[PDB]
Design a protein around this ligand. Structure first.
Ligand SMILES: [Mg+2]
Ligand SMILES: [Mg+2]
Ligand SMILES: [Mg+2]
Ligand SMILES: [Mg+2]
Ligand SMILES: [Mg+2]
Ligand SMILES: [Mg+2]
Ligand SMILES: [Mg+2]
Ligand SMILES: [Mg+2]
Ligand SMILES: [Mg+2]
Ligand SMILES: [Mg+2]
Ligand SMILES: [Mg+2]
Length: 218
RNA sequence: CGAGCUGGAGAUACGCUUUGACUCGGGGAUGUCCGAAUGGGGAAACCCACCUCGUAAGAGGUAUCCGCAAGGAUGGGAACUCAGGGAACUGAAACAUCUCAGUACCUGAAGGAGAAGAAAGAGAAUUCGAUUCCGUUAGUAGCGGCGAGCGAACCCGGAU
RNA sequence: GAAACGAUGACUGAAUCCGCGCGGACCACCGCGCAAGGCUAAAUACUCCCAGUGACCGAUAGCGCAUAGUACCGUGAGGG
RNA sequence: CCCCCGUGACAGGGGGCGGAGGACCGAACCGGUGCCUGCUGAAACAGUCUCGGAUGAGUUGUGUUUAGGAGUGAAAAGCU
RNA sequence: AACGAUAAAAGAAGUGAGAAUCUUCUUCGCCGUAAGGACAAGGGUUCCUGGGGAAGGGUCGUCCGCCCAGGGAAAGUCGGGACCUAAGGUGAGGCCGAACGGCGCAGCCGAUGGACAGCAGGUCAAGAUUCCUGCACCGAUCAUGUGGAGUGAUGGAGGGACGCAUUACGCUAUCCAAUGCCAAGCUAUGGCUAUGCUGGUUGGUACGCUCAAGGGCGAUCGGGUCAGAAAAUCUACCGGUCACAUGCCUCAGACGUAUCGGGAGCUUCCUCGGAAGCGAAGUUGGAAACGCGACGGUGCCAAGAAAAGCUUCUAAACGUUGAAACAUGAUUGCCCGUACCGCAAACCGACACAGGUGUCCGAGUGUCAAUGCACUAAGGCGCGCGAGAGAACCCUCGUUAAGGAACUUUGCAAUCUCACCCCGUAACUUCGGAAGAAGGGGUCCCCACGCUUCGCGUGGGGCGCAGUGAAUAGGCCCAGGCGACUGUUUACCAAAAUCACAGCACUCUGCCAACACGAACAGUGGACGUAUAGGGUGUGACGCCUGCCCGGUGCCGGAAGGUCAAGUGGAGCGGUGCAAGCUGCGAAAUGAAGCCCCGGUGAACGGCUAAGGUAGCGAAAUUCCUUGUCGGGUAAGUUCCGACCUGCACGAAAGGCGUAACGAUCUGGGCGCUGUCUCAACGAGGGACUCGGUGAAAUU
RNA sequence: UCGGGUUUCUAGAAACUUGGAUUUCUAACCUGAAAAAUCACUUUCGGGGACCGUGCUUGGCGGGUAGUUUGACUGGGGCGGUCGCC
């Protein structure tokens, strides 16, 4: 049904020319307003109304209704149901995703929608079904395993939502025929090999080759 | 001024003049609309509003920057002037230094001219005496892949 | 370059009175002048503009124009 | 999604029904394959016959944005 | 030479100095999803009327889109603006910048989107939802009366906000049929006399217990503060009570009544021809939208403007005796565009140019269907030199004896094929395809009968050489290379074996990310994305796969030691002076990133001494000798296929070997059928030749 | 804590110091949530914080770009040979 969002708009560059190569497809995707802080709410439950799939992301977002009679979208994690509910704030018991900080949080307690700076909403493991693993508590900072396979410090003043996401993992997704791309991306990359001395470093020759392996520009 | 005038254009018709026209000189009053343009909008000259006065018709104000305020300023001028920024072909019989050149052009500020100006100096006589210009000194002194080539100043005579 | 002085960007950063600057490395003696305040006629430049003059042209010359930046080309800047 | 059959693990196959698809043929439309014609042309790139795409990575309008060593480019140094 | 498309004319009459060409009439031909008609863009008066004939019009010209004067265009409701916002453009304060200047929230500007009140006809030579007529609707301001109480923000919320594909039912436009109905008269050539033939056969408004699909529907009390900044008698959320159906609300539209138009044609005059006035009928059945009922049904994923208008809630605020509202009249009604051309002699193309140009309407017959093909209505038009001749030669056509690819570089070219229906249909395979494989048969008319008819099937007869009897309308096959595939490219010599592609892999980036644009600790794109995400490179479905060498280059790491800048800092030497001092040069030490150096990585550069080619393929689009040798097909085969292998100079992601399917791809072969050829003939049309009119060019 | 210097009270003790590092803290500086979008402020504030970054200078890397260079003889040009002296 989708609802109460905004309108996006294709565009691949500013104050002039093409910056990030390619991309221009589209299909008028609107933007739904989310929430990655989940704090001015701290204290009330809400009925996960539904899990409306929404573009831009790839994370079956979830619809919530916090008692006040207000509305909000949430990165439906990995397992909430047709109307399961949830509260929020330190007085939160690490259940199916919650608006809880970090110290009060268990070890190796996979979560997500995590954060990088007190408030300033999420900013980590918010995609596909990325699972941020926790580890050691420290002074105030913690020890975490970001999807990357990295160990970064961060402190508890930075909320997070229980467990990982999923969106089933873009798996059986194979795209298919060129164009499933155009279904979004664009002019799928041009090989600087089949280009010209003129346009790219790899260019020239008379058959095929390599020599140096550099990127566009140098 | 003194007897024509009724714009080039010359064409028909009506007409104005010594009760002084016309032309000429010199101040006024009218002057829409656009354009710095400023009420607001805008594809220049077109659309649209508000306040104040007002019989209607109609009249004035409504940009911004400085400044209590009075008052000043935004734009425009052919070349000339000072500043900010600053090429290359070209020459070196090839080329990077150098040359062309601080030339071309851009930009800014102002004027009728500017800029520069009252020696913390020139310069060797214990001399001179603000700055600008011309003559000459001098193609010297000196700079220079010491190549190509570039090149002052005091002194002295004048403009003032 | 032995290279003074002026100049300014970054750093530092003195004296005020037998004080200070300079006189082309640097020191002495010698001499010259006094900075971190301002102002300033005149001669000099140019020529859109006016007058006068010319061993200047006199209509393929002279200004592009005996007038037109018009006609005409160009999306245009521009040319003409 | 509805039924039929089955039998060794088998899948499966059958009648219903539904309406998928850089699917099929073809006009518009969009291309431009081969031949001939044209070559001081009807035309500074075309005509006839012939041919490809045709719900798509489709075709197109208005508005607007991107530019010179720069843009743009399903990439020829192509177009600007 | 040419006179701008091979859509053809012909006569009569007229005008006039003068006519192949101007007007008129009557024949003819051409177009008819257009060569008809309506906007928009764009042009400007080309429009109309009266004149003209120099130049412009490829000849003429009495004519013109040309020359001249005059006229011609009319809106409260159509478009736009006085309303709205999108990309983008701007922009008080604010962020950056040698200058000029680049940014940038709000706000403002900005359609091609939203939003909003008129419909039927009439008519100047030339305009019409704009003028007239007929009735209507909209805001506004006013009065009259009803009402008798609130009204209700730059503010809240609701709402306006919308994708693609497919599709059920109702219908309207629109079209068709008929011994429906009205109108008019004639018919003869042999027949018919009317059951023939021709034309017309309704729109606006208003009322109607008529018919009616389809479409739209919760309400209300109360509660919870933590939500709408605030308030809220609204919204959001929570909970109790009655809602299958119905129940409502609503009608697309049909019918009837009435009224207003219009309506085949009819009457008189006509200054020569328009003008004026009159008026019949309105049937039954069938077809039928890409439009209307609408914000319908369903499925799908690649997930679908914003704002105001608008309903509602209140803060403020006014008054609660003359409100909000309703009705009835009264008054009001701004600016710009409104002619004509408009797929085209009136726009872009130097030209009255065979080109280009967005959207809408776009009839009938026949043909499964259609916006196709043939004819044709309406409507438009016969392309602005013309007339003879009937040679060569050239262009575009029709036929062709015997032969049938012998042509040739090659079957290039042109024939054959060609539609629907029934039968039938292989190798191979990713099981979907290959498949319209191949091959074969049928198709016309009539009568009867059976079927659901427009029509089809069963059967009997019929005519022709011939029955999609006209027009549209796949020739097929085997074998191989190259790329898997739809796609894309060299506007004006290359469409392909290019580019792209799904998929694979390397690699880098934790967020002010890498990366990129930029004068700029400005702004911004990546992304309102956060690692199953973003960049760069290379490889190119799927299949089995991906070998050996880190010496040299590049990268990541290690990281003792060697080397190395500025600077800190020290000996030391030296110049001048009487001295303090002032002063030239200065050195060991200490001082980074890298560089040396140690180690590693090949879907890194890359080689096959750092090492030597696993699988696989091999004379290959990479072979030189070479027409390799033998086998295949031919009578005969430099090329093609098969194998072998002595791989000049095959090789595993510049990927290797394969691969159903696909290809305006290239190579070889076969069947068919041909004028490609033996070898050309005849015939047509358009030039060429002749005469009259106008009259180039390169060149010299 | 490591560097040393200065001054005093006895190499130590004390103090004044002036440096490197580690760490730590934080008014500058930075940056994020809120009623008032970019910005200024109020503060919860939150966290970063002497780093980054901006300015001057140092040396490295730098076909990303720029300016350029790349001889002559030559029975044609390149390849080969050659170009001075006896
Ligand atoms: Mg003369
Ligand atoms: Mg002139
Ligand atoms: Mg066809
Ligand atoms: Mg903005
Ligand atoms: Mg003829
Ligand atoms: Mg004869
Ligand atoms: Mg075909
Ligand atoms: Mg291909
Ligand atoms: Mg293709
Ligand atoms: Mg270079
Ligand atoms: Mg060489």
């Amino acid at each position: 049904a989708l609802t109460e969002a905004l309108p996006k708009t294709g565009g691949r560059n500013n104050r002039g020319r093409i910056t990030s190569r390619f991309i221009g497809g589209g299909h008028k995707r609107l933007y739904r307003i989310i929430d990655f802080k989940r704090r001015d709410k701290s204290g009330v439950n809400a009925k996960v109304a539904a899990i409306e799939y929404d573009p831009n992301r790839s994370a079956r977002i979830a619809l919530l209704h916090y008692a006040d009679g207000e509305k909000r979208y949430i990165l439906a994690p990995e397992g909430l149901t047709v109307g399961a509910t949830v509260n929020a704030g330190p007085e939160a018991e690490p259940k199916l995703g919650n608006a809880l900080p970090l110290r009060f949080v268990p070890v190796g307690a996979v979560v997500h929608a995590l954060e990088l700076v007190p408030g300033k909403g999420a900013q980590l493991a918010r995609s596909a079904g990325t699972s941020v693993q926790v580890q050691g508590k420290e002074s105030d900072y913690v020890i975490v395993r970001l999807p990357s396979g990295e160990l970064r410090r961060v402190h508890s003043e930075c909320y997070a939502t229980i467990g990982a996401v999923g969106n089933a993992e873009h798996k059986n997704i194979v795209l298919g025929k060129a164009g499933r791309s155009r279904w979004l991306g664009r002019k799928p990359h041009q090989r600087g090999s089949a280009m010209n001395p003129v346009d790219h470093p790899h260019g020239g020759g008379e058959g095929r080759t390599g020599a140096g392996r550099v990127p566009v520009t140098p």
